[PDB]
Symmetry: C2
Subunit: 334 residues, 2 copies
């Protein structure tokens, strides 16, 4: 209960927590396509970190697909959806001791059912998959709505944290206080602008602005003044420029232009973003959308990291309004 | 913050909060039937207490139906469903001053979306419909899962309150402590048995055991040893017999046999119960299910209350796994 820190995603990762898609959710419409895509993502991540996949107790087809995958372990646990990033435990370092925090997940502001997602951490712990202390938190918080630099700086936005169906009894100050007490944040970087059409997580920061490293901040941008995102993303860029590290020096900002508009069978725009990447040990796995800009995005990133930049198609994922990072949650071992 | 009490349902009621059914929910399948039934229920309650109905902002058909109903006021507020009993504010008396508590409603353990339901109290307050202080509570609690006798005794069960998706960070003692601090309960009556097939509120007490008055407790029973409820309801009856008022004397128990099994188009059994009644000033409005037992239930109740016993058909309501009481929430004025 004194001097704790939230491990950064770019630190040494033991395994990546995921949840395989099943017929008992929204993936039922294209479950076949869902399985293939996830299988591809899983095999790619497995080459850089162990993978712990939650497979629904009545998901035989899925279990047989992951049963013999190298560097993949299966945990039989039911889920509502595959967004492990938002219901997965948050890992902190309490006085040097590793500790997992089981914050409440209520479906992005009670918009979707989450009776199973919210219990995943508990089940994984009782099943022995989490070899660390699991403390239950009396606050609603998604792992994708916050960003840690691993040194006291927590990046987040008001669009999500101040949403009425999260922690309504608290004010911005009350929420910032819990972030400092529960995550050990010494500085909370707040910004209120920026959004992604088709997204209903209330603008998770992991799709808008994130830490590439201790001194660098990556964010979504748009130059097409004709796109509906231009104005909002520009204001956010201005807000990000006011941020300062704990040493009072400014952050290195790296913009990532959003791909060309993408739509589904119902002509609904999807929230594609290259910001929803995954720092996975020796490799930086970045989402691609079969868009002319993919190649540029990858190269742009190779010039700000010694890590191997690998792209993986996420066109199937965004169909459900979420990308790569939202489907994962890193775990450590100390 | 000292000496508070939760007003009983059998006390002087100013108005009954309800939410009209609309096409933007599960009622869309039989919205026409839903409207008729609700209209009937509303007109019946209006004859004993004012009614405040939440009408969806884009529910024109509904607004025109309630627009000129005597003793009915309309508040334009969106909702997910019509269960005002579970998302409606809980009224207490703080040192004599009336106060409304806006507890969190997360869809009965995150089983259903509740982004709109959870915000109803706040919207009604900002719109001026609630002329009392509205304090936001950091706990999840449904009004139908608890019962107040108006004198310090709070009746409830573990099936609901100890459910993992309610207040997981607390233990039974932690929950009982908040009940004593927030509701002013001096005694909490706990029971762990009893259930209703087809119900997914996790056995709300308002469908199993309730206070008919300060000294009386009404509960659901079953004599058909062939029914799946027999064993469970009998154990609950034994638990209820151990309860004692604050003066150490036992409670007067009144059993109400559940109607003959009822099913929907998909042959799914529905949670019908006569316990889901409504104490409405000078009248006791009781649910009926066009079952041979209705007549008996009404007469049985007339012999334990000077109030007028009126029955109202709830066959349409139970189709959505809930009865009369679940569709209401009384409000006071002090």
């Amino acid at each position: 209960m004194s001097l704790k820190r939230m491990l950064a995603e770019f630190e040494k990762i033991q395994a990546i927590l995921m949840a395989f898609p099943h017929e008992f959710s929204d993936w039922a419409y294209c479950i076949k396509e869902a399985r293939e895509s996830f299988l591809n993502i899983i095999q790619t991540i497995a080459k850089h970190a162990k993978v712990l996949v939650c497979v629904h107790t009545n998901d035989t087809i899925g279990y047989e697909m992951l049963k013999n995958l190298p560097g993949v372990e299966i945990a039989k646990v039911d889920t509502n959806d595959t967004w492990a990033r938002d219901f997965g435990a948050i890992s902190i370092e309490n006085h040097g001791v590793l500790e997992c925090l089981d914050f409440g997940f209520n479906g992005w502001g009670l918009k979707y059912p989450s009776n199973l997602d919210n219990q995943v951490n508990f089940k994984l712990k009782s099943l022995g998959f989490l070899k660390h202390p699991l403390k239950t938190m009396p606050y609603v918080l998604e792992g994708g709505s916050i960003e840690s630099d691993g040194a006291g700086s927590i990046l987040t936005n008001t669009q999500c944290l101040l949403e009425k169906n999260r922690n309504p009894h608290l004010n911005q100050n009350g929420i910032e206080t819990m972030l400092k007490k529960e995550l050990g944040a010494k500085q909370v970087l707040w910004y209120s602008y920026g959004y992604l059409k088709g997204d209903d997580t209330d603008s998770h920061t992991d799709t808008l602005a994130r830490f590439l490293d201790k001194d660098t901040i990556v964010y979504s941008a748009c130059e097409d003044k004709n796109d509906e995102h231009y104005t909002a993303l520009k204001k956010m860029q201005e807000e990000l420029k006011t941020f300062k590290k704990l040493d009072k020096t400014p952050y290195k900002l790296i913009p990532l232009e959003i791909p060309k508009a993408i739509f589904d069978e119902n002509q609904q725009r999807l929230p594609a973003t290259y910001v929803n990447f995954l720092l996975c040990n020796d490799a930086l796995i970045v989402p691609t959308y079969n868009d002319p800009k993919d190649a540029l995005i990858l190269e742009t990133l190779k010039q700000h990291t010694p890590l191997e930049v690998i792209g993986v198609d996420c066109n199937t994922l965004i169909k459900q309004h979420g990308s790569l990072h939202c489907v994962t949650m890193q775990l450590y071992e100390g």
